Amino acid sequence: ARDLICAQKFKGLTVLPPLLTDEMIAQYTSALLAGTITSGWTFGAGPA
Amino acid sequence: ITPGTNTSNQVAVLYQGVNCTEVPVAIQLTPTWRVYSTGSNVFQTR
Numbered sequence: 209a210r211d212l213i214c215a216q217k218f219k220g221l222t223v224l225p226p227l228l229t230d231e232m233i234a235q236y237t238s239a240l241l242a243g244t245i246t247s248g249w250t251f252g253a254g255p256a
Numbered sequence: 257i258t259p260g261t262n263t264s265n266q267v268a269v270l271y272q273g274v275n276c277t278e279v280p281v282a283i284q285l286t287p288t289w290r291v292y293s294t295g296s297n298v299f300q301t302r
């Protein structure tokens with residue numbers, strides 16, 4: 209079926225992967241939740 | 257990928273969207289741009 213992705217890869221249209229993977233992005237959110245739950249707003253202003 | 261001309265002349269070359277194994281310069285467009293068959297260890301990234 210060739211899907212559409214490498215149908216588009218032919219004729220020279222390519223998608224560059226994002227610099228940050230999905231896992232690390234989720235890791236960033238997890239850290240934000242931990243700071244909010246355990247430290248409230250303090251971690252944003254300075255030391256948690 | 258270059259550290260900077262002032263810092264050094266060594267360079268790193270990334271071939272986008274290809275396996276290292278099937279299509280290296282070891283076996284090609286830009287032939288003078290060879291960087292040898294194995295200039296260093298080849299690393300297959302996403």
Ligand SMILES: *[C@@H]1O[C@H](CO)[C@@H](O)[C@H](O)[C@H]1NC(C)=O
Nearest residue numbers: 274275276277278300301302
């Ligand atoms: C081509 O690259 C993919 C992803 O890097 C890899 O899983 C696959 O094994 C490579 N092809 C071969 C024949 O190894």
